[PDB]
């Protein structure tokens, strides 16, 4: 079990850790989050009580170092930082526990939810989408735009998601114009899986990370990226049976976890009716389909 201490909590703020969150009052004595499960990625995030705009947050993995949070008053936000002095860190963590000022990562033991939302998400890949390699952890917020969104401004702050575009040369082999555009198997299997992602776990990892950024920061371009990666598969006549089965599990827990009140902006009506009812893969998403019909029949 790992720990993320906080130096202080100067400003009223809602703190999120993975799918859990807590209210913290201005200069309430809060000094961090304990018992965080080693073995998965995690994301700690933030929404100031004064500014419901801009949710922000840091992806991290405890195996990669000792991380903590410190408010920064020039910049006005909670900053994640790394302590390189191992002893000085265990020293701080031990003393705040003794003083019991830390909340406990509130995991029910029956629950695989966070594992299922992050199964294929690996920190090394996160840091290629959010390039800032002086830090082991990765900052995202609501307003960051994606590389595709920049093509259609500052690349230091860009989400370098893999660019997917159904009407491109990449996606369409000359002379198979019609074939490749009604049946994307070429694009999915040779271009994207074999070509760029190398394997389905890296594809699924990007898809899952896009979904979480949409859900925890309402990042609009991340939402676009997830839908794109779902669409490509659902619009491919020929998909490995094991991908179809894992996808069906993947989306299920995403649909499951999504706030009921946000289903209007986070779920693209067209993509989903196409996947569930029009595409080649209409009959292949039995868990996703069942959960979508019982929870969001209106969108369909």
């Amino acid at each position: 079990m790992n720990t993320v201490p906080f130096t202080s909590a100067p400003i009223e703020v809602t703190i999120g850790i993975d799918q859990y969150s807590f209210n913290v009052k201005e200069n309430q004595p809060f000094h961090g989050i304990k018992d965080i499960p080693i073995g998965h990625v995690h994301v700690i995030h933030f929404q100031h009580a004064d500014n419901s705009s801009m949710r922000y947050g840091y992806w991290f993995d405890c195996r990669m170092g000792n991380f903590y949070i410190q408010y920064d008053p020039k910049d006005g936000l909670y900053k994640m930082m790394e302590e390189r002095d191992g002893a000085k860190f265990e020293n701080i963590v031990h003393n705040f526990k003794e003083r019991q000022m830390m909340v406990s990562y509130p995991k029910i033991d029956e629950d695989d939810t966070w594992y299922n939302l992050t199964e294929f998400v690996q920190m090394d890949k996160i840091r290629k989408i959010v390039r800032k390699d002086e830090n082991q952890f990765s900052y995202v917020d609501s307003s960051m735009t994606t590389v595709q969104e920049n093509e259609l401004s500052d690349p230091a702050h860009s989400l370098n998601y893999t660019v997917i575009n159904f009407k491109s040369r990449e996606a369409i082999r000359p002379g198979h114009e019609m074939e490749d555009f009604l049946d994307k198997s070429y694009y999915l299997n040779t271009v994207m899986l074999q070509g760029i992602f190398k394997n389905s776990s890296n594809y699924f990892g990007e898809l899952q990370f896009a979904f979480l950024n949409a859900m925890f920061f309402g990042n609009y371009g991340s939402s676009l990226q997830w839908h794109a990666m779902i669409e490509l598969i659902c619009s491919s006549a020929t998909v490995p049976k094991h991908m179809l089965d894992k996808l069906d599990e993947i989306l299920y827990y995403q649909i499951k976890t999504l706030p009921e009140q946000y289903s209007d902006i986070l779920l693209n009506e067209r993509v989903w009716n196409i996947c569930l009812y029009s595409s080649f893969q209409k009959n292949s998403l039995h868990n996703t389909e069942k959960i979508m019909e019982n929870k969001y029949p209106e969108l369909l």
Partner: protein
Amino acid sequence: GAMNSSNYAELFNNDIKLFVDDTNVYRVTVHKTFEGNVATKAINGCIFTLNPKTGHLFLKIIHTSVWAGQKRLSQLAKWKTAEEVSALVRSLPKEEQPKQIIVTRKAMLDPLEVHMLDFPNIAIRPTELRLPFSAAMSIDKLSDVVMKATEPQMVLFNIYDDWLDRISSYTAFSRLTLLLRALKTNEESAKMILLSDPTITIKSYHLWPSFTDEQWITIESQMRDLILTEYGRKYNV
């Protein structure tokens, strides 16, 4: 963006643009089989690619052989249009390739767009105009070469005959579309009007009679009268 009455006079500026009408690419008759089921029999068809500014029409004849052993033929027709339109642009010299292609049916947007990926600076645009190009096969000489063809074939026409020698593209294109609108709503009368007088003939290199200026006016007025009659009949107004 899309083409409507606001941005109508753009058709006649000096930017090359083509209209593409795909309605007559895939043409069938429906008949009963010996077992009493229905079946279709395809006939020769054509793409109706037209430069509204010059009259140049690129009539690409589509031979029934192209459908042989294919499924979802109406869906395929759209992709064959876009494949033929694209090879037409490629066949033209650069300074003659169009800067915009306007499709008369939004279902052509995605197949053209995909086939023109080699041409990113050529804008593919829909329209909200209700153009009558489907009535193109009511033009005896265009229906005749389509139906006679025995193989794929491109036949070039000027759809304005020699009109531009005396009127603007704007006026030419309105005469064209009035005529075609009239041919669409009641072919028999429309063609009566055009040909009643045996003393006004069609030059061998022309599509329409060699009306004088004064006679075009009478024609245009008859066509208008026809089209307003047919509306009242359709709606009981």
